[PDB]
């Protein structure tokens, strides 16, 4: 099972989340961690496309 | 025993060493005594070692020692493919 439908990055996001590898992740956090590197810095795995 | 019997002007000299299975008294080779390994023992020895260059030295000094021995019983089969894990093609192509 994945996380609790939370971004796990900003801690305050329960809306249209995208799963990274085992947890969820919002749009702005995903784009921010993607535009600077290819890793996740939360699960330390490559981000989805 | 080797003891000089409780007295002597000369003591603790003439050390015998071993480099390539040949007794070196001070730098002169005495002889080499035959030892068989049949290959599987060779690779089992190669497994438990320290680092890479130690393996290189021990495998490069093997066939020069095998010149003083006669052992082709070593399995030239999948066992050799297992030994191939240590890619030392220069070493086996150095003795020619």
């Amino acid at each position: 099972l994945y996380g609790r439908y939370n971004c796990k990055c900003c801690w305050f996001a329960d809306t249209n989340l995208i799963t990274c590898n085992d947890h969820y992740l919002c749009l702005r956090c995903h784009q921010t961690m993607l535009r600077n590197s290819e890793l996740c810095h939360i699960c330390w795995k490559p981000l989805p496309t | 025993k080797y003891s000089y019997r409780l007295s002597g002007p000369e003591n603790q000299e003439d050390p015998l060493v071993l480099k390539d299975g040949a007794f070196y008294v001070g730098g002169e080779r005495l002889s080499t005594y035959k030892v068989e390994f049949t290959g599987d023992l060779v690779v089992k020895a190669l497994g438990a070692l320290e680092d890479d260059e130690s393996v290189v030295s021990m495998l490069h000094q093997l066939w020069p020692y095998l010149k003083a021995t006669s052992q082709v019983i070593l399995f030239q089969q999948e066992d050799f493919t297992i030994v191939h894990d240590l890619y030392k093609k220069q070493l086996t192509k150095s003795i020619e």
Partner: protein, 1407 residues
């Protein structure tokens, strides 16, 4: 009595009058320690009350004989006569006839009152019936379930419309914006006229800045005469404390004369001595440094020298003859202790160096301070180093012995210093700093810091501080730097945010260190609670009212502004403010836990005692039950019993439909009845069907006392970070009563499920449940209870246990709690002695406690000295009972939540704080009413929810452990400060062992590998500063996570020794020899107890003998023994104020069941400089004299590790303290093979390149393959010691033992590796493996960052047989062939008989 006082020069209770002084000796005999102490204190009191009347003097002696020992004939007519006398009494009073036999059986036989002895009187005194009428009148406990359910429905219906809809709820939503505004309003002072500069506000920070930026801009046989001066100064300080003179003043004057003669001898025979090296070394303006850290004006120095030689001629001759005849080893003084020290040269030298004297500013603008934010990365570390030097100088200033002033005094605004002590700290090549002070001891002083560049003493400043509060930054100039660096690196996600939060964090740490105050600790704890409430969604309405701390000084305002600005910079913003909120929460939690950097040592003992008494007595005065000095025996008067019954009624008069009483102490009778009823009929998660029933001179007892005291406790404090906790020290009998109640409640709790206070299994279960709840989004409620102790009452536990079923496991009889209720009634009538210092401070003196003291002084009775109350259960007195009550009530509250709000709650309590994980069906705004109702029900009980409690679905807290979605906060600063603090330095080996345990437990909680090496360097520098010198053992520097994960202290010492032996050709040989010995002993063969005979010799002969098992001839043995190290603790232990090994000590400590850390370090450095090293013949000598016998070897063997490893011939002058380091390495390797497997024999290989961003944290498990049978019981080590060392097992061991039978009847006889591997521990005083074998890992998991595991050294176990033993495939096929070929000779049954009786059935082997 005659036999007792005959031992103390006594008569035939006892008077001895001679001249004008009488010695009065009174004796008594009580075999029970309780009545023994009782009669002891009573006799002391009634003998001390008499000298007050006789003085208007006596020698008082009290002799309590704990037995009936005699010396008349022999042990025959002492006990037989008493036995036959009580026999005659049996054959031919009631209470005394029982006292005479209860008083003497042994100590316990029919005398120790366990919880099955109510057979004393069970009598009434016309007070118990009224007590039970006011305590057990509303308790029914037999209420049905449906009625309780509908009553709870109606109560929720009333609460939702009368207390919640009215806005009277005690919990609210966060409103993070409003939270930040309130934080900025309470912490960031805007109406204060203080400057925005920490150096301007804090005087110590100003001084540190001055010293730093005056040492970094100017500078940062020349060093021959300075060391000569330092050596003779050390010599004169040596003869300062030997009392080789009559009066202290003459001693100081003679040492001054010696120093002055040294000065005049150095002046000549050199071109420029004082103008070149003294000005650049140890000398100040017109004054010279002397013994006892003093600095004396050269003028007045020679003026004092003129006296005692002109008014007392021929003084030098006899004053030197008394020294030479007393110590002919310090006679290195040859031209100093001579006649007149050339006075005219002295005055010319004085008139040469005419400079201004130190001013010593006693009285407490432009801001030229370079704006610390915009400082380079070097000036900040220089500031930290300056703080370290100044703090070490403060600590050494506390080290100054109490001397006397030789000058006359003229502290108002300024003092021209001439007879002040000074501590000198070396800063740069030319400039050195001086710290002047005029007081001694451990009290707070007013220090003055000056510098000396080339003789120009410039004033750096003056400040006022307490010395014992600056021990943390003493040598941690790199530890705190690495802490701040890693905290800043935690914020690497926002390149820029770390750039602003780094310097702010360093400035905050610097201000915290330069101003250690309890107010800053309280403010940082408040910030911790604020962050906890900010991360979650629901918090108490009185939260911000508890975060405010009155500054009372600008040094607090600056740190509060810094902390609030850091919190705002990390939290404030509209959208791009919570990018990585996990990192932000970790950073802010560590910043708030930085309060542990400030020590907790009661800046003022009397003030904190007053505050503790205030916190203890304020709830009683506010309640209305504060009876003073009731009886001290148990006979309350009419007004006393009246006020006690009124207090009980007020405690049990809380209704269920009133919201104006949710703060006063008490409990609702109906709610408690519902709780007990739901607990009885197995409705709650805990049940009354318990298991292992806890049931396992005081002649007449009642509800108040037992005529053996009145359960007398005494009030005191306990040093904590935030606020000093309460503490109650009780007498022997009341301590036994508390122990009884504690065992009862603890057994009951072990029968329960959800209580986790002394059950680590349940605590780990709660941890895992909390982790999965935070990961699943459950509502975690981290509840704290305010004033748990001061509000809890023994009467409440009485009312609880009155109708508790507590059913037996097998009997089902509802065991009566009559004895438990009796001792709880005793606790209800306990008597708390107020501190005598508090009383004497209140007599010589607005405050509520002070007002009550003034009112009770003479208006009502006499001086208050004893306090009785119904509430205020002693913190730590009924701890497990309070835990049981809280657990029962919290399970009732969880059932109520499940009933009303249809949620799934699971709670875990710890008698102080609890955590409730609530799984919600089908934000957090609809659950606010549930939280308010839960808090209301808790306040209806005695469970007032503290405003520090938080409710949310993001982070949980329990037992100072914070759990976050997907991880856990490491709490780095807490553990780092714990490593820097609590340095109990008694023996450097013990110091390093404690530091290693702390570093292991910190690395377990993911601190670092770069901070732990700096902590180890700091500890090694602390040991080296004490004069002990560096030893091959001690703190492990340059360590890896593999040295802590799957590695014990023995492996750390092994790695340290291996790091000492670079290019390991010798330690590798020792490891090969140890592997050979272990293959010989483990493999079985014959190796058990000859090794014990071979080891008992020592280190040299044992190492030789162990080398003789290998082929180590007299060539390799001498090559191995060449490496030596000076072992100061060779002939025993160091003497500090028959030397069996520490293994016996730890065994004795395991079988059986106030001073500051700076004072401890001072005592450590003081005892490490005196006669501590013993030479075996009883004559202790100095460490300097041991290390002076070393010679300059420099033969490539003493150069691989200077001052650590020496040669064999380099210690010829001192060979008694010369032990082989390689023998210790051999022993450590063998013990590591014992404890954690065979991989301690292979050589260390490294990973090649490995990129983990310094934040890839993960949990790793210890990879130990321990082969010690995994049990290692105490009765195994005891049996092995009995077998191997019988003469050491009889004496110094097992005198205090009654279970020798099980240790004797071969209890798992001859455990593997418990004969030689226990000898290596018994003979090596720094190895200590059995202490680790008789213990758990205590971590069982290690949070580490992947950047350290990728750098981890690779060292795995390798078979020494080169995979040639049997090739287990061959083992199994040979067994199969044997089985088949033996079956094909006759039909055999395929049972285990035809399998175990086969040779090749070695399948039971091959792990």
């Amino acid at each position: 009595e005659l036999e007792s006082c005959e031992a103390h020069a006594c008569q035939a209770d006892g008077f001895k009058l001679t001249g004008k002084t009488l010695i009065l000796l009174e004796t008594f005999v009580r075999v029970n320690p309780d009545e023994f102490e009782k009669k002891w204190k009573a006799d002391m009191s009634k003998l001390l009350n008499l000298k007050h009347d006789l003085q208007k003097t006596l020698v008082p002696i009290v002799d309590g004989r704990s037995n009936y020992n005699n010396r008349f004939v022999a042990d025959w007519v002492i006990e037989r006569i008493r036995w036959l006398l009580i026999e005659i009494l049996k054959a031919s009073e009631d209470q005394e006839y029982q006292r005479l036999i209860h008083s003497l059986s042994n100590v316990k036989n029919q005398s120790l009152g366990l919880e099955n002895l109510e057979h004393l009187k069970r009598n009434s005194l016309d007070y118990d019936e009224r007590l039970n009428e006011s305590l057990f009148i509303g308790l029914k406990g037999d209420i049905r379930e449906s009625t309780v359910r509908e009553e709870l429905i109606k109560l929720k219906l009333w609460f939702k419309d009368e207390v919640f809809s009215k806005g009277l709820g005690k919990f609210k939503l966060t409103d993070r914006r409003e939270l930040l505004e309130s934080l900025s309003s309470l912490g960031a002072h805007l109406d204060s006229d203080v400057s925005s500069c920490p150096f301007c506000n804090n005087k110590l920070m100003e001084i540190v800045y001055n010293v730093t930026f005056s040492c970094v801009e100017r500078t940062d046989t020349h060093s021959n005469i300075e060391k000569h001066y330092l050596s003779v100064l050390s010599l004169c300080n040596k003869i300062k404390g030997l009392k080789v003179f009559n009066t202290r003043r003459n001693t100081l004057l003679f040492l001054d004369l010696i120093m002055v003669n040294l000065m005049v001898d150095i002046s000549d025979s050199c071109q420029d001595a004082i103008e070149s090296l003294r000005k650049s070394g140890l000398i100040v303006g017109q004054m010279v440094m002397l013994v006892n850290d003093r600095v004396l004006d050269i003028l007045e120095a020679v003026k004092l020298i003129r006296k005692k030689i002109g008014t007392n001629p021929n003084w030098v001759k006899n004053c030197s003859k008394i020294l030479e005849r007393s110590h002919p080893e310090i006679w290195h003084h040859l031209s100093t202790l001579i006649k007149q020290p050339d006075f005219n040269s002295l005055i010319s030298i004085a008139q040469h160096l005419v400079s201004d004297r130190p001013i010593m500013r006693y009285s407490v603008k432009i801001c030229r301070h370079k704006l610390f934010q915009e400082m380079s990365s070097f000036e900040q570390m220089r500031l930290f180093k300056t703080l370290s030097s100044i703090s070490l100088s403060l600590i050494n200033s506390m080290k100054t012995s109490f001397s006397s002033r030789l000058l006359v005094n003229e502290y108002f605004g300024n003092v021209r210093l001439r007879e002040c002590y000074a501590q000198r700290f070396y800063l740069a090549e030319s400039l050195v700093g001086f710290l002047f002070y005029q007081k001694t001891g451990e009290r707070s002083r007013c220090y003055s810091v000056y510098l000396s560049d080339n003789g120009v003493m410039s004033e750096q400043g003056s400040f006022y501080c307490d010395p014992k509060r600056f021990f943390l930054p003493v040598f941690s100039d790199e530890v705190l730097a690495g802490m701040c660096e890693e905290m800043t690196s935690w914020l690497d996600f926002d390149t820029g945010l770390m750039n602003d939060t780094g310097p702010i964090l360093r400035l905050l740490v610097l201000a915290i260190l330069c101003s250690p105050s309890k107010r800053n600790q309280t403010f940082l704890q408040g910030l911790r609670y604020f962050l906890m409430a900010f991360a979650n969604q629901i918090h108490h309405i009185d939260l911000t009212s508890k975060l405010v701390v009155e500054c009372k000084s600008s040094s607090e305002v600056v740190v509060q502004r810094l902390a609030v600005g850091l919190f705002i910079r990390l939290l404030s913003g509209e959208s791009d403010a919570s990018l990585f909120f996990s990192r932000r929460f970790k950073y802010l939690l560590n910043v708030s836990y930085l309060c542990h950097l400030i020590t907790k040592e009661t800046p003022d003992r009397l003030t904190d005692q007053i505050k503790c008494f205030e916190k203890f007595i304020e709830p009683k005065v506010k309640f209305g039950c504060a009876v003073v000095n009731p009886s001290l025996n148990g006979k309350l008067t009419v007004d006393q019993e009246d006020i006690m019954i009124n207090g009980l009624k007020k405690f049990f008069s809380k209704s269920l439909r009133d919201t104006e009483d949710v703060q006063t102490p008490g409990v609702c009778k109906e709610l408690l009845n519902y709780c007990v009823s739901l607990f009885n009929r197995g409705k709650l998660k805990v049940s009354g069907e318990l298991k292992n029933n806890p049931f396992r001179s005081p002649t007449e007892f009642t509800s108040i006392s037992s005529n053996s005291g009145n359960l007398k406790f005494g009030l005191s404090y306990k040093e904590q970070v935030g606020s000093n906790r309460e503490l109650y020290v009780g007498d022997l009998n009341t301590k036994l009563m508390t122990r009884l109640v504690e065992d009862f409640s603890e057994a009951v709790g072990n029968s329960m499920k959800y209580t986790c206070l002394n059950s680590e299994k349940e605590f780990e279960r709660a941890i895992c449940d909390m982790k999965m709840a935070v990961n699943n989004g459950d509502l975690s409620c981290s509840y704290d209870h305010s004033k748990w102790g001061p509000t809890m009452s023994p009467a409440l536990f009485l009312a609880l246990l009155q109708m508790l079923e507590l059913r037996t496991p097998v009997d089902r009889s509802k065991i009566d709690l009559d004895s438990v209720k009796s001792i709880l009634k005793w606790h209800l009538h306990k008597v708390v002695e107020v501190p005598i210092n508090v009383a004497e401070a209140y007599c010589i003196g607005t405050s509520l406690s002070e007002e009550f003291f003034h009112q009770t002084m003479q208006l009502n009775g006499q001086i208050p000295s004893h306090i009785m109350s119904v509430l205020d259960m002693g913190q730590g007195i009924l701890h497990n009972t309070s835990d049981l009550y809280g657990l029962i009530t919290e399970q009732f509250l969880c059932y109520a939540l499940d009933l009303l709000y249809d949620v799934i709650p699971v709670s875990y309590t710890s008698s102080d704080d609890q955590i409730t994980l609530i799984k919600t069906p089908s934000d957090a705004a609809e659950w606010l009413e549930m939280i308010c109702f839960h808090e209301f029900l808790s306040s209806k009980l005695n469970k007032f929810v503290s405003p520090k409690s938080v409710i949310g679905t993001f982070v949980a807290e329990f037992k100072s452990r914070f759990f976050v979605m997907g991880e856990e906060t490491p709490l780095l600063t807490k553990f780092v400060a714990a490593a820097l603090h609590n340095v109990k330095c008694k023996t450097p080996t013990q110091l390093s062992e404690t530091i290693d345990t702390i570093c292991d437990q910190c690395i377990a909680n993911g601190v670092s590998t770069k901070i732990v090496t700096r902590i180890s360097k700091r500890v090694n520098q602390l040991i080296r500063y004490s004069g002990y010198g560096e030893t091959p053992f001690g703190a492990i520097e340059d360590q890896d996570v593999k040295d802590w994960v799957d590695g014990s202290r023995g492996y750390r010492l092994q790695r340290k020794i291996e790091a000492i032996f670079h290019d390991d050709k010798e330690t590798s040989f020792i490891r090969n020899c140890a592997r050979k010995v272990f293959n010989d002993i483990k493999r079985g063969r014959i190796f058990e107890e000859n090794l014990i005979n071979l080891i008992g010799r020592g280190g040299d002969e044992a190492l030789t003998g162990f080398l003789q098992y290998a082929g180590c001839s007299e060539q390799e043995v001498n090559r191995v023994l060449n490496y030596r190290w000076v072992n100061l603790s060779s002939f025993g232990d160091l003497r500090l104020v028959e030397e069996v090994p520490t293994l016996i000590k730890t065994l004795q400590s395991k079988l059986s069941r106030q001073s500051s850390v700076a004072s401890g370090f001072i005592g450590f450095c003081k005892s490490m400089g005196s006669k501590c090293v013993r030479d075996g013949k009883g004559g202790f000598l100095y460490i300097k004299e041991v290390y002076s016998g070393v010679s300059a070897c420099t033969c490539e063997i003493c150069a691989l590790k200077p001052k650590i490893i020496y040669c064999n011939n380099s210690l010829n002058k001192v060979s008694q303290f010369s032990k082989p380091i390689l023998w210790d390495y051999f022993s450590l390797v063998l013990t590591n093979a014992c404890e954690l497997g065979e991989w301690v024999f292979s050589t260390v290989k490294e990973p090649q390149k490995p990129l983990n961003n310094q934040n890839f944290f993960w949990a790793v498990k210890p990879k130990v393959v321990r082969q010690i049978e995994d049990q290692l019981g105490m009765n195994h080590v005891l049996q092995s010691i009995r077998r191997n060392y019988p003469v050491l097992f009889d004496e110094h061991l097992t005198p205090f033992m009654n279970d020798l039978q099980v240790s004797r009847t071969m209890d798992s006889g001859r455990l593997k590796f418990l004969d030689v591997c226990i000898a290596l521990d018994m003979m090596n005083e720094n190895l200590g493996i059995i202490s680790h074998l008789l213990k758990t890992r205590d971590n069982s998991v290690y949070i580490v960052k992947q950047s350290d595991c990728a750098l981890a050294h690779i060292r795995q176990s390798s078979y020494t047989d080169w995979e040639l033993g049997l090739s287990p495939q061959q083992i199994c096929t040979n067994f199969k062939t044997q089985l088949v070929l033996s079956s094909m000779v006759n039909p055999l049954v395929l049972s285990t008989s035809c399998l175990k009786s086969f040779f090749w059935f070695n399948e039971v082997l091959e792990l």
